[PDB]
Design a binder for this molecule. Structure first.
Ligand SMILES: Nc1ncnc2c1ncn2[C@H]1C[C@H](O)[C@@H](CF)O1
Ligand SMILES: Nc1ncnc2c1ncn2[C@H]1C[C@H](O)[C@@H](CF)O1
Ligand SMILES: Nc1ncnc2c1ncn2[C@H]1C[C@H](O)[C@@H](CF)O1
Ligand SMILES: Nc1ncnc2c1ncn2[C@H]1C[C@H](O)[C@@H](CF)O1
Ligand SMILES: Nc1ncnc2c1ncn2[C@H]1C[C@H](O)[C@@H](CF)O1
Ligand SMILES: Nc1ncnc2c1ncn2[C@H]1C[C@H](O)[C@@H](CF)O1
Ligand code: MET
Ligand code: MET
Ligand code: MET
Ligand code: MET
Ligand code: MET
Ligand code: MET
Lengths: 291, 291, 291, 291, 291, 291
């Protein structure tokens, strides 16, 4: 029952994703292919990252993560292939995933395959890694790769060999740490008592606002559930509510709820209504909070 | 070969669905996960209900329907699970689905699991049920659930256990009928011989206007195939046409067809052209039909 | 363990595709269903052609291609089922797909089933065929096909039967060639050394511009990589760049690239930036190339 | 104390109209300049015609009408200047404008100056003319007319001269009739007792729908106030109402009104609500009327 | 030097306003016609009101105010004609208009002519009145009024007679107070210390937000210049700034300024940037303030 | 016959302009008020400057130009007033305006009054000046000005006094040159023989693209009428065309014209079709031109 979780920027409007899928079923007949999603803002390693980092704990051990935006397609760049260390708890409390106490996942049990363009930056910081190879072997990639379609040549295809039990260390030479491209995560800055950060995501389709202030940033400024907070966005729009577990706590439909999202981050929303869209709020806007 | 049929309001823009699925594969390795749709209007129970009500006859026996919009996530609210009675024929006519004379489905052959928020109103109505349980049990749901993701935790996780043969009656206590939340279906009123309903839906991607006026309503208003009909939408836009079985019956491309859809409800369209988009006709406008 | 590749115009916003999937698993329990796409401009056979013609080389032998837009749903028309001849190499060079030198594919190995309305013009033109049959037999279509849903009834259902091993030849009588509807393909003309075409397509979600000026057309005015081209779009927009394999080749982000796409056609784009979106370029605009 | 009525396509977003106004006050210091409108769809002579043809009855005798869209600005074309014959009654009944029984207007009393490009087709057709002259004399146009600004040079400037008393006959040689460009006016056809036209216009800012089915056309299939009409728009939209003088006559706010507009043409609207805006109705759509 | 200030809902895209203007110049040759504006949301007596109430003090004594939205056009309704009592100070301080100490305007010096549909409600409350007549005399209105164009028949035309020195009391019978239609102004409600009201206007094109909380509501809750205020809109969006005279006081460009507008009302804005549009704020949204 | 030429950013949606005008008529009863435009981009000095710089030659002698965007309203900032020196020829060529050989204007014949915010940068440049005064005096401005309406109080009111013959030198103290705020005009740089400017404006309503590249720049780049030009906008969209005097010179409707506008700046358009709107070309994009 080998599984591939597939995340790309290819979209769902044409056959691009189907092609990789065919090659996946062709290379590894027992495989199950799981779409993560294919709508990510193209060439955006940063937004890509957030769609792939929280996945491991949800998935059966042995799962192979094919994750690709490939703006450097057709050049001499080459994919990176890594077994991650810690499967890693997550959520708003930090716990394993599933029924009961959740399923605990053994160490070193997932492999990510991706452009070496910093797509994995956060996956690496949060899960760490056991081993890292450059994807070069003609047994796992095409001899004559489609110049403009490396997401399929250099990620979808070798991912399937990986699903079909190809020895990881045979994909190419070991990559050393400095050789794995990284993107810079900007930090939560202090400023008085207030923690200062940014809107990381509009949580579609609900229109919820996610921020890059983690609970750890919060529960280290001594902010916990129950505190009246002032959250200011775009520099100009203040908001006031207690930090609550979820949306129905804000009371009436339309009320403002400040919560920790399912990925562990400070968030703000309207209770059963969209916050972002009516006010046209967006990713990258400033976001400051204080008790 | 267990089937989970999954209908959510999670959208396909991020990994929300993939996290559910991965856990589905974790709990039930042999399962097949089929996406119904994932794009329904957020928190819109009535809408969610149309995408799920019609499915049973189409699926093999023992299929689990994971159907979910969860605006009460994080509350002490618990899910509901039901084995439905009649799989029920459908379409414009009232026939079983499939090749030849259609395949019949044994009774008591499909389990719905959903928020107990009224999402199953029309399923329960159209299908009846044999049993119904509150989903409280720590063997099928998490001990500490993510307060913002009850679609994952109270729907996605349980359904995989049920697909994998977890006894339905052991998920929690027997709910009675009154404990199963309903929304009441606004009924087709009547002025003279005219019938007064609503645009229940715009049929994407085609722009076909679906009304809440069912075959049964037309029968015993005396309205059969070939009756010349005057139908008015939004109280402003009239259309005159005989009731035909299909679009091409209109004649010239772009002509008005009045018809019964693959669900058996009164509908209007242009033939091989889009009706609702040029006219910006939306869900919920009044729908009136005289002969 | 057979595969159906499913392409329609049904959208992913309601339960329609799912319904087909349900019957596919119902008739052929061991099938894997692979979504090609379901977002094609409705009733646009030429567009639907694009999303299916390149598929066969990517799928294992025995894959069944279920391809459908049915404006004539509810009429006396019946689908056509065909065994293609050549699997066809493809892409920019014209080569097998896969790792190594690629998965060479045997002849006579894929079946397409489709409305008989020219959806398979391209597929035939490019792959040839071995046999063709009218899909009529009630062993593979309903005796009472739902008038408005021929894509489920006359394509999905019989695809499932074929996939499971229903012999192709038993679907109904064989079709003589002139009975297979084709649409006209506007050809690439010549003017001086220039080539005159159209914008076949916008490459979503990126915004690349696709033409119907194939490499064979190019390789017949002598045009290869590194040639200083002038590509005029919409009759008023000269573009001037070398023909290059990939986007990075243009240098700086946002620069103009003239390349051959993964399908083998002359195209134009910007290096890691959108060409079509800011300037609202569209399918059907004039396309001209010369050195 | 003379008046120039100024209609152009120049917009009101820059200093362009002002520039003309400046020269008007410069050459004829005592002029009053009256803005007709300057928002007409650029280069659309038929549209520009609408905004000028009804003017003369509303203005004192001696008013000069400066009317201009000049796509041919910078060429050898020269404006035409004409003294209209009949001032023309107008409106729904056909009557003089003003208090009491209205300001009866003497014949030969208004001058139009315009590009010779059919802008005055309607005005001539409906008012006749007494004399016509090519505007050439350097006493009334620049010796070096700004190539791209003929509306200022070949219309505004000479309008100012005429207004001040420059004799019409001295502007240049007289034009024979065939030298006065007209565009074709599609006429109102007949079918049974029905009348077949178009939507001449959207009545901004309200959203009333205007047709080219005049009252004379109506008064020739015998159609008067109180007649039960069926007005079909865009070929698929029957509308059914009596012909009535004003909007209130339809009863409730939002109801459908069929009336004769202030220009004398059959129109359709809603009582104190917009018809055209919600349903995106447009100029050029088919219009048909019958009792 | 008689002046007419003209306010309507007729728009600037067609010749409608020109027509009234011609009749105005025809009836009263010495008149100067001053457009107030013609873009007011059609049929909106409430929004109309705000465009006409502050005008008197700006204008030469004797000025006649023609102000019209006429949704009851063509019925037996008839305009109202009134000399207002107090010219009335205004602004944010309350003062006469102009250089020095401004120009003080004698009492009973302006006349408004308008539909009797409550257009004048606020003009009457704020300026009071000396005398009021119904506009019925055929010497000042047409004998056969254009049914759909009463703004010109029943306002523009008699306004000009009024400008030309027609005795006011000769327009028709005296109207008694109850006979002048009024619209209801909703009040500023108290709620703790906070005054509760509503967004009356987006101040176009700057995108400023105006409210219906007057200074008098403020300077009676003891709120003056210098107080830190909390202004909440749409129920959800709080704002915090001191009440300041103008926008540059907010400091940086983009900063929030809470001010008294030029009409004397509590307002909020960004300093040299739009507040309303980026957040899509609008008229009629709730607005609450507290010190 | 005093003329006030009035250019504001007040817009024509409300009565802001009418309040200015009414005071203008109050102070100077014989004045004629001519609207330049009122719709310029709010607070945009550079833009405001293009609508005002070109006007002098067009107007009679002694015309006062009220020109105003006032983002510093309410500050201690005071207006500036200037008698300009040269009225200055213009257009593509450098000619006086009007019929025959154009009318010449005496020097020192027009007064600008404006915020001293740089709005008069290009007026002062193009015209020079003889005198310049800070507008501080309580005989021409209010003793207590409305803090939000300095366009009315520091521009509209003064200008009417100046129209009515209030001695220019008595409005306040003599400002010197350095006290007159300027914005520096971004200059046409140069790469090889190519010229690098900006889209200075989109010419509404036509969609004509105006660049900052002036005739003088083209002369002594050696570029004259009939030179074959390659012009690139936004660094992406090239256009090739000979320099022609006007649009019709392009040939077929819709063809590319490269030309000099009624202001003498390099420009590009389609012939009698719109260039900027289909392509969404906006003000401020790079403008490059090689021969
Ligand atoms: N225009 C473009 N420039 C650079 N990279 C691009 C591009 N359009 C698409 N891509 C990348 C993005 C896809 O993930 C990759 C698959 F091969 O190709
Ligand atoms: N803004 C919101 N208010 C209330 N409930 C919300 C919400 N955004 C999302 N949800 C609910 C609805 C989703 O189906 C559920 C997933 F478990 O979380
Ligand atoms: N409005 C329409 N007119 C003609 N054909 C239509 C239509 N809307 C959908 N269809 C076709 C296209 C779908 O694939 C098929 C269902 F089988 O029905
Ligand atoms: N792009 C254009 N092509 C042809 N004619 C145009 C044009 N833009 C504006 N015009 C015409 C229309 C204007 O009224 C006239 C100025 F006198 O110039
Ligand atoms: N559709 C309409 N219903 C009611 N009144 C309307 C209307 N369209 C325009 N009007 C009114 C609005 C105009 O002010 C008035 C001028 F006569 O006519
Ligand atoms: N939001 C705003 N910020 C700064 N200044 C503003 C503003 N809205 C309007 N103004 C200025 C600009 C106007 O021209 C001036 C009128 F006197 O008031
Ligand atoms: C807030 S509804 C659940 C889905 C959401 N995208 C999440 O990650 O939690
Ligand atoms: C009417 S076209 C077929 C698909 C459609 N959404 C349906 O349910 O019938
Ligand atoms: C240009 S990125 C690769 C996918 C693209 N849609 C293609 O078919 O080639
Ligand atoms: C319908 S309101 C009156 C003005 C309208 N535009 C007309 O010309 O009749
Ligand atoms: C705020 S800028 C000045 C114009 C505005 N509409 C007002 O009434 O004050
Ligand atoms: C080029 S068409 C004439 C009007 C234009 N706005 C100009 O200034 O020239």
């Amino acid at each position: 029952r080998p599984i591939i979780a597939f995340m790309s920027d290819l979209g769902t409007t044409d056959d691009s994703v189907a092609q990789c899928k065919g090659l996946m079923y062709s290379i590894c007949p027992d495989v199950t292919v799981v779409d993560v999603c294919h709508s990510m803002t193209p060439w955006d390693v940063e937004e890509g990252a957030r769609y792939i980092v929280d996945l491991p704990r949800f998935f059966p051990e042995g799962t192979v993560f094919a994750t690709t935006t490939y703006p450097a397609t057709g050049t001499t760049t080459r994919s990176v292939a890594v077994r991650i260390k810690q499967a890693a708890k997550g959520g708003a409390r930090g716990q394993w995933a599933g029924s009961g106490a959740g399923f605990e996942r053994a160490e070193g049990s997932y492999i990510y395959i991706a452009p070496n363009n910093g797509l994995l930056t956060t996956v690496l910081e949060e899960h760490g890694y056991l081993e890292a190879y450059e994807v070069t072997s003609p047994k796992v990639i095409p001899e004559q790769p489609e110049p403009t379609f490396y997401s399929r040549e250099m990620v979808a295809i070798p991912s399937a060999h990986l699903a079909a039990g190809f020895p990881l260390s045979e994909v190419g030479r070991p990559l050393e740490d400095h050789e794995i491209v990284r993107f810079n995560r900007p930090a939560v800055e202090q400023d008085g008592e207030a923690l200062v950060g940014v809107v990381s995501a509009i949580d579609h389709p609900f229109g919820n606002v996610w921020t890059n202030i983690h609970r750890t940033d919060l529960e280290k400024a001594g902010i916990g559930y129950g505190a009246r907070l002032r959250l200011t966005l775009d520099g100009v729009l203040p908001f006031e509510a207690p930090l609550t577990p979820t949306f129905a706590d804000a009371g009436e439909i339309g009320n403002i709820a400040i919560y920790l999202n399912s990925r562990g981050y400070l968030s703000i929303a309207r209770n059963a209504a969209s916050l972002a869209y009516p006010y046209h709020l967006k990713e990258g806007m400033s976001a400051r909070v204080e008790a």
